[PDB]
Amino acid sequence: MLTIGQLARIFEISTKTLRHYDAIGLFVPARTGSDNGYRYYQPEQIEQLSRILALRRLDVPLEAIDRLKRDGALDDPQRLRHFLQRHQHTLREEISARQRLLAELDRTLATLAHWRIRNMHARIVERPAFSVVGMEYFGSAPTIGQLWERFIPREHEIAGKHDPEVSYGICAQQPNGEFHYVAGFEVQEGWPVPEGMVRFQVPAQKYAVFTHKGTAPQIAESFQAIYSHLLAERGLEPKAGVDFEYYDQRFRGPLDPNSQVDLYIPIY
Ligand SMILES: Nc1nc2c(ncn2[C@@H]2O[C@@H]3COP(=O)(O)O[C@H]4[C@@H](O)[C@H](n5cnc6c(=O)[nH]c(N)nc65)O[C@@H]4COP(=O)(O)O[C@H]3[C@H]2O)c(=O)[nH]1
Numbered sequence: 001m002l003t004i005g006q007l008a009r010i011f012e013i014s015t016k017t018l019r020h021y022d023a024i025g026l027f028v029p030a031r032t033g034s035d036n037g038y039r040y041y042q043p044e045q046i047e048q049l050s051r052i053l054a055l056r057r058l059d060v061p062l063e064a065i066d067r068l069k070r071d072g073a074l075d076d077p078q079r080l081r082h083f084l085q086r087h088q089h090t091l092r093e094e095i096s097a098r099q100r101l102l103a104e105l106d107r108t109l110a111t112l113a114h115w116r117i118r119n120m121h122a123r124i125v126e127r128p129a130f131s132v133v134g135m136e137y138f139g140s141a142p143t144i145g146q147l148w149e150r151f152i153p154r155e156h157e158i159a160g161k162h163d164p165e166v167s168y169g170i171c172a173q174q175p176n177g178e179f180h181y182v183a184g185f186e187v188q189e190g191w192p193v194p195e196g197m198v199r200f201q202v203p204a205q206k207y208a209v210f211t212h213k214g215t216a217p218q219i220a221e222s223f224q225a226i227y228s229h230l231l232a233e234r235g236l237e238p239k240a241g242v243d244f245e246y247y248d249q250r251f252r253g254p255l256d257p258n259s260q261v262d263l264y265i266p267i268y
């Protein structure tokens with residue numbers, strides 16, 4: 001025979017969970033110690049307690065278990081299997097119903113994007129030429145976001161940062177056809193350029209500035225809307241030159257949906 005401590009041990013439960021079961025009359029010990037008032041169980045009851053605890057593991061309430069114990073369904077493998085399949089069917093439907101909501105949710109998230117784009121209004125500004133030092137990349141890559149994580153650990157090595165709280169994602173066109181991306185900071189001329197990095201000069205330009213209020217992978221969608229109609233709808237025409245992303249305090253990481261990024265679109 002097993003003591004309540006031995007039983008509770010091999011099932012890793014508390015000893016009063018078992019006295020409780022005894023008070024309910026759900027799981028009664030085979031006999032009570034006639035000289036210590038202790039509870040003692042038979043090895044034949046292990047599989048019975050095992051099934052009781054397996055129901056509790058399925059979050060089945062104890063009063064349910066007590067209902068099964070009384071009307072004999074708990075000690076019947078066919079009636080018990082029936083209870084479990086039924087409960088299984090509910091779990092599957094609760095999952096299906098929630099999965100349907102995720103589709104409706106994801107469909108609703110898409111419409112929120114168009115609403116955001118419709119609210120991305122342009123502000124026109126002219127800015128003089130300024131110098132940028134950082135890690136450049138020559139070539140039409142299918143990575144940028146990787147250039148940034150390639151660039152963030154070496155940011156410290158840039159001396160003479162005129163304004164360290166703002167950085168730039170510059171994209172310059174080449175008569176090549178290819179484009180030239182550079183991630184860096186505005187720094188005054190004369191300071192040394194860390195090894196493996198470059199100094200890029202952004203010319204003076206007229207700009208249309210669109211505030212992208214979203215994630216960084218979502219930046220491309222803003223660019224698409226900008227060149228598909230947003231400039232035209234405002235009678236502005238893009239001009240060949242260098243654009244850039246303007247990251248300041250409003251930027252909170254490439255995957256934070258609360259990040260804001262100004263996109264300086266050169267125009268006529
Ligand atoms: N103080 C106390 N302890 C209990 C009681 N019921 C179970 N135990 C504990 O459970 C062990 C084995 O239980 P068992 O199957 O009755 O197996 C027992 C039982 O079959 C038999 N036995 C020993 N003493 C007595 C006794 O006073 N009366 C009876 N009828 N049988 C006894 O010898 C086996 C070995 O017993 P133990 O080595 O002492 O070890 C016992 C004892 O530590 C109880 O009412 N009082």
Ligand SMILES: Nc1nc2c(ncn2[C@@H]2O[C@@H]3COP(=O)(O)O[C@H]4[C@@H](O)[C@H](n5cnc6c(=O)[nH]c(N)nc65)O[C@@H]4COP(=O)(O)O[C@H]3[C@H]2O)c(=O)[nH]1
Nearest residue numbers: 059060061062063064065066067068069070071083086087
């Ligand atoms: N046919 C049927 N009768 C229902 C239903 N819901 C309640 N009842 C009746 O109402 C009594 C108490 O229901 P309760 O307050 O929800 O209290 C319930 C509940 O808290 C728990 N319980 C028992 N069976 C189940 C079960 O299958 N699932 C769950 N989740 N809880 C149960 O234990 C109590 C059961 O006490 P009983 O003596 O069985 O008595 C039950 C039962 O006769 C139902 O969906 N179908």
